[PDB]
Amino acid sequence: NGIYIWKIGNFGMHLKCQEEEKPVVIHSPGFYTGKPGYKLCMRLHLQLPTAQRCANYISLFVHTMQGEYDSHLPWPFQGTIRLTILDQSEAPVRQNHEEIMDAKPELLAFQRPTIPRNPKGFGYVTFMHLEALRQRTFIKDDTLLVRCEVST
Template sequence: MADAHSERQTSIFSPPFYSSPTGYKMRARLYLNGDGNARHTHMSPSFVLMTGEYNGILKWPFNHKVTFCLYDQSSQNRHVIDSFRPDIKSNSFQRPHSDMNIAGGIPEFFPVSMIQQTGNGYSNYY
């Protein structure tokens, strides 16, 4: 979080993974201090399509619902779950022509102010 606030590292990536054994290669990208209009106000999770082994046999553009979940680790079960359907006209969801496409996601997913509250149930850091 400190690196995100100081803008030393604005985002972090998950390791790449496949949607199924012969599926789309992808990874998650998280802007801990927000992206775009949500910069400094919200955490912004994103979805990134990558060049994968099976791209030649997959249907393009990618048109599957993407869901992000932030799990409340306390007993209150205040999970944050949001989804989006890709804009199939966006370059983010076309067949990748380089290692990774531009990320697409949910800019205003979760307020930064809430993740910084002590005992928030989502993080061990505050």
């Protein structure tokens, strides 16, 4: 299984713009599920307080990118993606917030990408409520940890 931990720095600033009702949208670097493996990346939003549904939620989405090994891998990507926002409080057992999502072959999002970054992504509009960040040490040293673990 490939595992990638996205360190999102400067996070205090990002929460501040969300409060000021400024759209916040971030993309991870690309990363490989393996070598050879798929190249994926992540989209995280901070939803405005004035949104209809999902107000004040964190959104989280996985996208396929064009990769070195694309021509060698089976398409569409089929498998499991586990998206976790990690707890950095000092307290076993730590309480991570995670959702496990199933890659179904019927989706367009995991078809072979032809553009550098496929705009069709797959994930959760309502991944985690912001008011859950104020209730655990999810942010430490002004940094948020988003873990992506891919199973095939």
